[PDB]
Protein backbone atom coordinates (compact mmCIF):
# COMPACT_ATOMS: atom_id res chain seq x y z
CA UNK A 1 0.00 0.00 0.00
CA UNK A 2 3.08 2.18 0.07
CA UNK A 3 2.20 3.31 -3.45
CA UNK A 4 -1.16 4.54 -2.16
CA UNK A 5 0.58 6.44 0.64
CA UNK A 6 2.85 8.03 -1.97
CA UNK A 7 -0.18 8.84 -4.14
CA UNK A 8 -1.78 10.81 -1.31
CA UNK A 9 1.57 12.40 -0.43
CA UNK A 10 2.05 13.53 -4.04
CA UNK A 11 -1.46 14.97 -4.10
CA UNK A 12 -0.35 17.01 -1.06
CA UNK A 13 2.29 19.00 -2.95
CA UNK A 14 2.60 22.31 -1.05
CA UNK A 15 2.81 20.42 2.23
CA UNK A 16 5.99 21.01 4.18
CA UNK A 17 7.73 17.68 3.51
CA UNK A 18 6.99 17.67 -0.22
CA UNK A 19 7.92 21.34 -0.59
CA UNK A 20 11.27 20.76 1.15
CA UNK A 21 12.04 17.73 -1.01
CA UNK A 22 11.06 19.57 -4.20
CA UNK A 23 13.30 22.53 -3.30
CA UNK A 24 16.48 20.54 -2.56
CA UNK A 25 15.75 18.31 -5.57
CA UNK A 26 15.20 21.32 -7.89
CA UNK A 27 18.62 22.60 -6.82
CA UNK A 28 20.14 19.21 -7.71
CA UNK A 29 18.54 19.18 -11.17
CA UNK A 30 19.75 22.73 -11.78
CA UNK A 31 23.27 21.60 -10.86
CA UNK A 32 23.02 18.58 -13.19
CA UNK A 33 22.63 18.59 -16.99
CA UNK A 34 19.51 19.67 -18.88
CA UNK A 35 18.89 16.04 -19.98
CA UNK A 36 20.35 13.23 -17.82
CA UNK A 37 19.75 9.54 -17.03
CA UNK A 38 17.83 9.08 -13.79
CA UNK A 39 18.97 5.86 -12.08
CA UNK A 40 15.51 5.21 -10.62
CA UNK A 41 12.05 6.91 -10.66
CA UNK A 42 11.88 9.96 -8.28
CA UNK A 43 8.12 9.30 -8.07
CA UNK A 44 7.87 5.43 -8.14
CA UNK A 45 4.09 5.41 -7.70
CA UNK A 46 3.59 7.71 -10.69
CA UNK A 47 6.05 5.69 -12.77
CA UNK A 48 4.42 2.34 -12.00
CA UNK A 49 0.97 3.83 -12.60
CA UNK A 50 2.09 5.22 -15.98
CA UNK A 51 3.61 1.84 -16.87
CA UNK A 52 7.19 1.72 -15.55
CA UNK A 53 8.40 -1.80 -14.76
CA UNK A 54 11.65 -2.74 -13.04
CA UNK A 55 12.89 -4.81 -15.98
CA UNK A 56 16.02 -4.57 -18.07
CA UNK A 57 14.90 -2.24 -20.84
CA UNK A 58 12.92 0.39 -18.93
CA UNK A 59 14.99 3.57 -18.69
CA UNK A 60 14.08 6.86 -16.94
CA UNK A 61 15.58 10.13 -18.27
CA UNK A 62 14.97 13.51 -16.57
CA UNK A 63 14.72 16.76 -18.61
CA UNK A 64 14.23 20.44 -17.86
CA UNK A 65 12.58 22.74 -20.40
CA UNK A 66 12.21 26.51 -20.13
CA UNK A 67 8.65 27.54 -19.32
CA UNK A 68 6.62 30.49 -20.53
CA UNK A 69 5.54 31.44 -24.03
CA UNK A 70 7.07 32.31 -27.38
CA UNK A 71 2.42 36.61 -26.73
CA UNK A 72 2.14 33.69 -29.14
CA UNK A 73 1.10 30.41 -27.53
CA UNK A 74 2.61 27.08 -28.56
CA UNK A 75 -0.08 24.52 -29.36
CA UNK A 76 1.89 21.61 -27.89
CA UNK A 77 2.99 21.30 -24.29
CA UNK A 78 6.26 21.48 -22.40
CA UNK A 79 5.69 17.76 -21.82
CA UNK A 80 5.69 17.23 -25.59
CA UNK A 81 8.88 19.27 -25.99
CA UNK A 82 10.63 17.35 -23.20
CA UNK A 83 9.51 14.00 -24.63
CA UNK A 84 10.71 14.90 -28.12
CA UNK A 85 14.11 16.05 -26.85
CA UNK A 86 14.58 12.92 -24.71
CA UNK A 87 13.61 10.72 -27.65
CA UNK A 88 16.02 12.49 -29.99
CA UNK A 89 18.83 11.93 -27.48
CA UNK A 90 17.81 8.27 -27.01
CA UNK A 91 16.88 7.73 -30.66
CA UNK A 92 16.98 3.93 -30.24
CA UNK A 93 14.33 3.82 -27.49
CA UNK A 94 10.56 4.21 -27.62
CA UNK A 95 9.07 6.91 -25.40
CA UNK A 96 6.46 5.22 -23.23
CA UNK A 97 5.23 8.07 -21.04
CA UNK A 98 6.33 11.16 -19.13
CA UNK A 99 5.37 12.87 -15.88
CA UNK A 100 5.97 16.15 -14.06
CA UNK A 101 8.31 15.98 -11.08
CA UNK A 102 9.22 19.58 -10.29
CA UNK A 103 8.35 23.03 -11.58
CA UNK A 104 10.76 25.89 -10.65
CA UNK A 105 10.18 29.46 -11.88
CA UNK A 106 12.36 29.47 -15.04
CA UNK A 107 12.39 25.78 -16.00
CA UNK A 108 10.05 22.82 -15.64
CA UNK A 109 11.15 19.27 -14.87
CA UNK A 110 9.79 16.06 -16.37
CA UNK A 111 10.92 12.41 -16.02
CA UNK A 112 10.31 10.40 -19.25
CA UNK A 113 9.85 6.58 -19.11
CA UNK A 114 11.37 4.86 -22.15
CA UNK A 115 11.46 1.25 -23.30
CA UNK A 116 14.16 -0.53 -25.30
CA UNK A 117 12.43 -2.22 -28.28
CA UNK A 118 15.51 -4.34 -29.06
CA UNK A 119 16.03 -5.93 -25.63
CA UNK A 120 15.15 -9.61 -25.41
CA UNK A 121 13.11 -9.20 -22.22
CA UNK A 122 10.96 -6.55 -23.90
CA UNK A 123 10.66 -8.64 -27.08
CA UNK A 124 9.54 -11.77 -25.21
CA UNK A 125 7.18 -10.07 -22.76
CA UNK A 126 3.71 -9.23 -24.05
CA UNK A 127 2.16 -5.92 -22.90
CA UNK A 128 5.29 -4.28 -24.35
CA UNK A 129 5.95 -6.09 -27.61
CA UNK A 130 3.29 -3.82 -29.07
CA UNK A 131 5.79 -1.00 -28.56
CA UNK A 132 8.31 -3.36 -30.11
CA UNK A 133 6.17 -3.28 -33.28
CA UNK A 134 7.33 -0.70 -35.86
CA UNK A 135 4.14 1.40 -36.01
CA UNK A 136 5.17 3.06 -32.73
CA UNK A 137 8.33 4.84 -33.87
CA UNK A 138 8.58 8.32 -32.32
CA UNK A 139 5.16 8.45 -30.69
CA UNK A 140 6.31 11.63 -28.94
CA UNK A 141 7.06 13.18 -32.34
CA UNK A 142 3.70 12.10 -33.79
CA UNK A 143 1.60 13.09 -30.76
CA UNK A 144 0.76 9.53 -29.68
CA UNK A 145 1.61 9.97 -25.99
CA UNK A 146 -0.79 11.21 -23.30
CA UNK A 147 0.15 14.87 -23.80
CA UNK A 148 -0.20 14.45 -27.56
CA UNK A 149 -3.67 12.94 -27.18
CA UNK A 150 -4.69 15.75 -24.81
CA UNK A 151 -3.39 18.46 -27.13
CA UNK A 152 -4.97 16.92 -30.24
CA UNK A 153 -8.33 16.52 -28.48
CA UNK A 154 -9.04 12.77 -28.62
CA UNK A 155 -12.24 12.81 -26.59
CA UNK A 156 -15.73 11.73 -27.58
CA UNK A 157 -18.79 13.96 -27.34
CA UNK A 158 -20.31 17.21 -28.57
CA UNK A 159 -17.36 19.27 -27.31
CA UNK A 160 -14.87 17.51 -29.63
CA UNK A 161 -16.73 17.25 -32.95
CA UNK A 162 -14.04 19.03 -34.98
CA UNK A 163 -10.97 17.54 -33.29
CA UNK A 164 -11.71 13.85 -32.71
CA UNK A 165 -10.77 11.41 -35.49
CA UNK A 166 -8.21 13.99 -36.60
CA UNK A 167 -8.89 17.67 -37.19
CA UNK A 168 -7.29 17.84 -40.64
CA UNK A 169 -8.95 14.56 -41.62
CA UNK A 170 -12.37 15.85 -40.53
CA UNK A 171 -11.87 19.15 -42.36
CA UNK A 172 -10.81 17.34 -45.53
CA UNK A 173 -13.82 15.01 -45.32
CA UNK A 174 -16.20 17.93 -44.83
CA UNK A 175 -14.60 19.88 -47.70
CA UNK A 176 -14.51 17.06 -50.28
CA UNK A 177 -17.12 17.32 -53.02
CA UNK A 178 -18.48 13.82 -53.65
CA UNK A 179 -19.85 13.11 -57.13
CA UNK A 180 -21.47 9.75 -57.81
CA UNK A 181 -22.07 8.01 -61.13
CA UNK A 182 -25.86 8.51 -61.23
CA UNK A 183 -26.43 12.09 -60.10
CA UNK B 1 -20.25 27.85 -52.66
CA UNK B 2 -16.82 27.35 -54.24
CA UNK B 3 -14.75 29.90 -52.32
CA UNK B 4 -12.32 27.07 -51.46
CA UNK B 5 -10.39 24.69 -53.74
CA UNK B 6 -12.93 21.97 -54.47
CA UNK B 7 -10.91 21.16 -57.59
CA UNK B 8 -8.07 19.82 -55.46
CA UNK B 9 -10.66 18.40 -53.03
CA UNK B 10 -13.10 16.59 -55.33
CA UNK B 11 -13.71 12.83 -55.43
CA UNK B 12 -15.45 10.64 -58.02
CA UNK B 13 -16.92 7.17 -57.45
CA UNK B 14 -15.83 5.46 -60.66
CA UNK B 15 -15.02 2.30 -58.67
CA UNK B 16 -18.53 1.69 -57.31
CA UNK B 17 -18.91 -1.68 -59.13
CA UNK B 18 -15.29 -2.51 -58.30
CA UNK B 19 -15.87 -1.98 -54.59
CA UNK B 20 -19.15 -3.91 -54.82
CA UNK B 21 -17.29 -6.87 -56.34
CA UNK B 22 -14.53 -6.53 -53.73
CA UNK B 23 -17.04 -6.53 -50.86
CA UNK B 24 -18.87 -9.54 -52.29
CA UNK B 25 -15.55 -11.38 -52.59
CA UNK B 26 -14.78 -10.47 -48.98
CA UNK B 27 -18.12 -11.98 -47.81
CA UNK B 28 -17.21 -15.20 -49.71
CA UNK B 29 -13.76 -15.13 -48.10
CA UNK B 30 -15.45 -15.06 -44.69
CA UNK B 31 -17.78 -17.92 -45.66
CA UNK B 32 -14.88 -19.91 -47.08
CA UNK B 33 -13.19 -19.49 -43.70
CA UNK B 34 -16.34 -19.89 -41.56
CA UNK B 35 -17.88 -22.30 -44.04
CA UNK B 36 -20.74 -24.08 -42.10
CA UNK B 37 -21.26 -20.96 -39.91
CA UNK B 38 -23.32 -17.85 -40.76
CA UNK B 39 -21.09 -14.90 -41.94
CA UNK B 40 -22.47 -12.62 -39.18
CA UNK B 41 -23.49 -12.77 -35.51
CA UNK B 42 -27.01 -12.83 -33.97
CA UNK B 43 -27.97 -9.26 -33.01
CA UNK B 44 -30.78 -8.31 -30.61
CA UNK B 45 -33.95 -6.34 -31.35
CA UNK B 46 -33.85 -2.82 -29.94
CA UNK B 47 -36.40 0.04 -29.99
CA UNK B 48 -35.15 3.25 -31.64
CA UNK B 49 -34.51 6.10 -29.20
CA UNK B 50 -36.39 9.37 -30.02
CA UNK B 51 -40.21 10.06 -30.25
CA UNK B 52 -39.84 10.28 -34.07
CA UNK B 53 -38.58 6.68 -34.45
CA UNK B 54 -39.77 4.88 -31.23
CA UNK B 55 -42.57 3.10 -33.13
CA UNK B 56 -40.01 0.87 -34.88
CA UNK B 57 -37.33 -1.64 -33.90
CA UNK B 58 -33.93 -2.38 -35.41
CA UNK B 59 -30.95 -4.65 -34.80
CA UNK B 60 -28.73 -3.65 -31.89
CA UNK B 61 -25.12 -4.30 -30.99
CA UNK B 62 -25.33 -7.30 -28.67
CA UNK B 63 -27.44 -9.21 -26.20
CA UNK B 64 -27.62 -8.26 -22.53
CA UNK B 65 -26.18 -10.42 -19.75
CA UNK B 66 -29.44 -11.19 -17.94
CA UNK B 67 -31.37 -11.86 -21.15
CA UNK B 68 -28.64 -14.33 -22.13
CA UNK B 69 -29.03 -15.87 -18.67
CA UNK B 70 -32.80 -16.11 -19.10
CA UNK B 71 -32.34 -17.69 -22.53
CA UNK B 72 -29.99 -20.19 -20.90
CA UNK B 73 -26.88 -19.34 -22.94
CA UNK B 74 -23.71 -18.86 -20.85
CA UNK B 75 -21.80 -15.60 -21.17
CA UNK B 76 -18.40 -17.03 -22.05
CA UNK B 77 -19.99 -19.35 -24.63
CA UNK B 78 -22.28 -16.94 -26.49
CA UNK B 79 -19.56 -15.10 -28.51
CA UNK B 80 -18.07 -18.52 -29.23
CA UNK B 81 -21.29 -19.99 -30.67
CA UNK B 82 -21.88 -16.77 -32.57
CA UNK B 83 -23.93 -14.36 -30.45
CA UNK B 84 -22.94 -10.72 -30.02
CA UNK B 85 -22.75 -9.53 -26.41
CA UNK B 86 -23.30 -5.95 -25.23
CA UNK B 87 -22.41 -5.34 -21.59
CA UNK B 88 -23.40 -1.66 -21.79
CA UNK B 89 -27.10 -2.07 -22.58
CA UNK B 90 -29.73 -2.41 -19.85
CA UNK B 91 -33.11 -3.96 -20.55
CA UNK B 92 -35.13 -1.59 -18.30
CA UNK B 93 -38.33 -3.32 -19.48
CA UNK B 94 -39.86 -6.77 -19.49
CA UNK B 95 -40.96 -6.14 -23.08
CA UNK B 96 -37.40 -5.87 -24.42
CA UNK B 97 -36.28 -8.67 -22.10
CA UNK B 98 -38.98 -11.02 -23.43
CA UNK B 99 -38.45 -10.11 -27.08
CA UNK B 100 -34.72 -10.83 -26.87
CA UNK B 101 -35.09 -14.06 -24.89
CA UNK B 102 -37.60 -15.26 -27.50
CA UNK B 103 -35.10 -14.40 -30.24
CA UNK B 104 -32.38 -16.36 -28.43
CA UNK B 105 -34.73 -19.33 -27.99
CA UNK B 106 -35.37 -19.29 -31.74
CA UNK B 107 -31.60 -19.26 -32.33
CA UNK B 108 -31.26 -22.19 -29.92
CA UNK B 109 -33.98 -24.13 -31.74
CA UNK B 110 -32.33 -23.52 -35.13
CA UNK B 111 -28.68 -24.01 -34.06
CA UNK B 112 -26.46 -27.05 -34.66
CA UNK B 113 -23.43 -27.54 -32.38
CA UNK B 114 -20.46 -29.76 -33.20
CA UNK B 115 -18.81 -31.56 -30.26
CA UNK B 116 -15.43 -29.82 -29.86
CA UNK B 117 -12.71 -31.97 -31.52
CA UNK C 1 7.61 8.37 -63.65
CA UNK C 2 11.39 8.55 -63.99
CA UNK C 3 11.64 5.10 -62.40
CA UNK C 4 9.09 3.76 -64.90
CA UNK C 5 11.01 5.24 -67.83
CA UNK C 6 14.21 3.75 -66.41
CA UNK C 7 12.57 0.33 -66.18
CA UNK C 8 11.24 0.55 -69.74
CA UNK C 9 14.69 1.59 -70.99
CA UNK C 10 16.79 -0.95 -69.06
CA UNK C 11 17.42 -4.55 -70.06
CA UNK C 12 16.45 -5.95 -66.66
CA UNK C 13 13.27 -8.06 -66.78
CA UNK C 14 9.85 -7.13 -65.46
CA UNK C 15 9.06 -8.74 -62.10
CA UNK C 16 5.55 -9.91 -62.92
CA UNK C 17 3.59 -10.47 -59.71
CA UNK C 18 1.36 -13.57 -59.62
CA UNK C 19 -2.22 -12.81 -58.57
CA UNK C 20 -1.97 -14.03 -54.99
CA UNK C 21 -4.64 -13.11 -52.46
CA UNK C 22 -4.42 -13.01 -48.68
CA UNK C 23 -7.73 -14.84 -48.21
CA UNK C 24 -9.01 -17.90 -50.04
CA UNK C 25 -12.30 -17.59 -51.93
CA UNK C 26 -13.62 -21.17 -51.61
CA UNK C 27 -13.83 -23.73 -48.79
CA UNK C 28 -11.14 -26.40 -48.96
CA UNK C 29 -10.36 -29.64 -47.17
CA UNK C 30 -11.82 -33.10 -46.75
CA UNK C 31 -15.06 -31.98 -45.09
CA UNK C 32 -18.68 -32.04 -46.22
CA UNK C 33 -18.88 -28.33 -47.01
CA UNK C 34 -15.62 -28.47 -48.97
CA UNK C 35 -16.77 -31.49 -51.01
CA UNK C 36 -20.21 -30.02 -51.72
CA UNK C 37 -19.20 -26.41 -52.39
CA UNK C 38 -19.65 -25.18 -55.97
CA UNK C 39 -17.08 -22.54 -56.89
CA UNK C 40 -19.09 -21.33 -59.90
CA UNK C 41 -22.04 -20.55 -57.60
CA UNK C 42 -22.45 -17.73 -55.11
CA UNK C 43 -22.51 -17.78 -51.31
CA UNK C 44 -26.30 -17.52 -51.07
CA UNK C 45 -26.87 -20.20 -53.72
CA UNK C 46 -24.47 -22.61 -52.01
CA UNK C 47 -26.13 -22.07 -48.64
CA UNK C 48 -29.58 -22.50 -50.20
CA UNK C 49 -28.50 -25.88 -51.56
CA UNK C 50 -26.98 -26.78 -48.18
CA UNK C 51 -30.04 -25.78 -46.17
CA UNK C 52 -28.14 -23.28 -44.02
CA UNK C 53 -28.51 -19.61 -43.06
CA UNK C 54 -25.57 -17.42 -44.22
CA UNK C 55 -26.82 -13.99 -42.94
CA UNK C 56 -28.61 -13.58 -39.56
CA UNK C 57 -29.47 -9.93 -40.14
CA UNK C 58 -32.15 -7.93 -41.92
CA UNK C 59 -32.42 -8.16 -45.70
CA UNK C 60 -30.67 -5.19 -47.33
CA UNK C 61 -32.39 -5.84 -50.65
CA UNK C 62 -34.40 -8.22 -52.78
CA UNK C 63 -33.14 -11.78 -52.86
CA UNK C 64 -33.38 -14.34 -55.61
CA UNK C 65 -36.76 -16.10 -55.93
CA UNK C 66 -35.28 -19.33 -54.61
CA UNK C 67 -33.08 -17.74 -51.96
CA UNK C 68 -33.45 -19.33 -48.51
CA UNK C 69 -30.18 -18.15 -46.96
CA UNK C 70 -31.04 -14.59 -45.85
CA UNK C 71 -33.16 -14.72 -42.70
Amino acid sequence: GALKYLEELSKKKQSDVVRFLLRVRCWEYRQLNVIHRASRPSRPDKARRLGYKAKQGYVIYRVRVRRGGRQLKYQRSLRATAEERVGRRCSNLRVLNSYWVNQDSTYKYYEVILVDPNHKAIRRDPRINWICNPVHKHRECRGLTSTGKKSRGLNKGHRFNKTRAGRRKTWKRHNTLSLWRYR
Amino acid sequence: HFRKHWQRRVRCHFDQPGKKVTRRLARRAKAAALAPRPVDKLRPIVRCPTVKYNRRTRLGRGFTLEELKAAGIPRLLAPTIGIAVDHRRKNLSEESLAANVQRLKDYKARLILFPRK
Amino acid sequence: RELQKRKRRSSRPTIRMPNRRKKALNPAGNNIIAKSWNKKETLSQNYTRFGLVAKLGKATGGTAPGNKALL
Binding site: - | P38, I81, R110, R116 | -
Partner: peptide, 21 residues
Amino acid sequence: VLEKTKKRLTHFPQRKYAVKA
Protein backbone atom coordinates in the same frame (compact mmCIF):
# COMPACT_ATOMS: atom_id res chain seq x y z
CA VAL D 1 0.57 -14.82 -25.63
CA LEU D 2 -0.33 -14.33 -21.98
CA GLU D 3 -1.21 -17.27 -19.74
CA LYS D 4 -4.68 -15.91 -18.92
CA THR D 5 -5.50 -15.53 -22.62
CA LYS D 6 -4.12 -19.04 -23.17
CA LYS D 7 -6.45 -20.41 -20.47
CA ARG D 8 -9.45 -18.54 -21.88
CA LEU D 9 -8.77 -19.93 -25.36
CA THR D 10 -8.14 -23.43 -23.99
CA HIS D 11 -11.47 -23.57 -22.16
CA PHE D 12 -13.60 -21.49 -24.58
CA PRO D 13 -12.29 -21.85 -28.15
CA GLN D 14 -14.26 -20.87 -31.25
CA ARG D 15 -16.82 -23.60 -31.89
CA LYS D 16 -18.03 -25.12 -35.14
CA TYR D 17 -21.73 -24.57 -35.72
CA ALA D 18 -24.45 -24.07 -38.32
CA VAL D 19 -27.93 -22.54 -38.39
CA LYS D 20 -30.74 -24.40 -40.14
CA ALA D 21 -32.66 -22.65 -42.90
